[PDB]
Amino acid sequence: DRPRFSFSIAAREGKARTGTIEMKRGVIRTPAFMPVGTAATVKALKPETVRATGADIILGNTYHLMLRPGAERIAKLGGLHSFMGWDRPILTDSGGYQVMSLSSLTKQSEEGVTFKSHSRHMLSPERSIEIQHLLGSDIVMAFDECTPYPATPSRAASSMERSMRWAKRSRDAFDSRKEQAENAALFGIQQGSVFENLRQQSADALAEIGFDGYAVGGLAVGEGQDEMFRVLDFSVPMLPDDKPHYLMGVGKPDDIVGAVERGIDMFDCVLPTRSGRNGQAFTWDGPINIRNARFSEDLKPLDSECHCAVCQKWSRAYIHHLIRAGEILGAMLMTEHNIAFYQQLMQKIRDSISEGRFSQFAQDFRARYFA
Template identity: 70%
Template sequence: MAQAFGFQVAATDGRARTGVISTPRGDIRTPAFMPVGTAATVKAMLPGSVRATGADILLGNTYHLMLRPTAERIARLGGLHTFMDWQRPILTDSGGFQVMSLAGLRKLTEEGVTFKSHIDGSRHVLTPERSMEIQRLLGSDIVMCFDECPALPATDAEVAKSMALSMRWAQRSRDAFGDRPGHALFGIMQGGVTRDLRAESAEALRAIGFDGYAVGGLAVGEGQEAMFGVLDYAPGMLPDEKPRYLMGVGKPDDIVGAVERGIDMMDCVLPSRSGRTGQAWTRRGQINIRNARHQDDPRPLDESCTCPACTNYSRAYLHHVNRAQEIIASMLLTWHNLHYYQELMQGLRDAIAAGRLAQFVADFHALRAEGDIEPIA
């Protein structure tokens, strides 16, 4: 019999929590950052390399995988874990966010969304039931409800209508998910930046009952101040004994602020996407390795970092291979960024466990405020 999905909080510091999500495929230490493997790969990384950075779980993308190579093909080939050679937990999103971003290529009804593929223009229908079927075929460990995410800014009436639809879809997702021991289904809170709508959404989700809860509809253009404003109250509306997942976040200071406010899980394409465009995230902030100041610099990106990019290569080399558009540039900077993100998560976990989160956060912001090391004269 499959091991049950579970969540245990080990320590708290203010509203921040550290603990463990247990799954049949392994434990997920929280707070957790999930690298994004959109098309069954974290771009420019081998699965073993992603694991070496400290990642316990990856995110796969329902929308992209249903179009290519198709969920049915992945199922025939043994499921997503085997297909991409990642035997640890995988969370799949529902496809709702990607469909939202198609805008002119979609038609929304009570039943679901009809849209045209961005690849070949073929017509597809995504409903809560179909989303659950696709995620079952993929074999993901954590499945997300199918929801509608309105782009902000939007009127209260638009947000309220969208939230109500998402809650009806949440019930349909729950019904279609059924009983799958060892697999978890997360509900998604909506409601924009309106407290009453967030409360209404949370109440609806709690009445349905889920294995975990996501705070959706943020990081879609509302800005950090507005996002933190919602996170000041939204996580507290969700069950304490279940994991809380903030979708699509984010920058390191977004992550720190979200953890302070009680978030347990996050994902974002930023560390891998930045790595492919010459951007490196360090304790001192962001570095553009393409800048000429690095071309003669023999020092590492970050002298305290133990990733291969920092251990074995200079800024000068990373500048050169990036300017020359060599593939190793994407590989090394992506590895570095993912390593930095996972090191940040470990630091947050340790600080919460030790009851010194406030000091950790103060040090984090102070070092970033100093900026990058001085260039070589």
């Protein structure tokens, strides 16, 4: 039987790594992309379709699930895996980001965050870890605070310091719960905004506590790709080399490629699902908006090389019609293609690192995608 958690690196090229995370519910190939399963569904896809695209693990939103249908209710029904019909690993976020971005009103303190639903509710390190346990999460995220951008050095420091205190509370809550500690993994989240010294203090604090994996938090919050890459340049080397590195909320295909070049192993983002429902399809020649009139009689598939079931059967012209008409099948087909495209990107990244040709792949990818 598989271990609780084992990360093995099979090949490296510069800062990039490829390998596997073994967990009780399955193997995760890295670098990995996690489709987002917001409120117990990857929007518009059956779980079998999510798996057919190549996904090894999905993300669940703790903030949404604790509000509807409720964490205790999901536990009573047998846990999130049984409830939604996904039997492979699930990573749950902590709620610390979505509570601040989606709640109508919030009250922040050293204890946690009190908030009104968009009903009064509470999130703290202890309650977040408990909710993730009730959901039956395989990878549990420490409860943190995503510092707004831009941030002054003083405010970034105060925020990061609170997050590190919350990281220790998250560790202790996770470890106190025997079944969770034995069957799940816990990741810590680095903060510190764009400041190298704060990023280093945060990395040091997280390594002293000790986690199964380490996320670079506080990015993709408005700073732009150049600045995100500059922060990753110094931030990723601060994290333990032998554990996974997770960049949450990222991103566009070129964001992912450049982040892998900087040592990131795991990603999640709503872009392929949400923008798919809006009509944006990803292709190796860049994104297209299928709503555009130029696609009304285009018999080609969404992408000329994509191996997904959508590109094997249906034309741009048909999908154009469905999206223009507001048809559910349009959202279904766009989403399946986009998630499959993201998985094919991850597969090409993994294969190119394994073969020592990732630098060339990244150059060729960018030249064609931006042509």
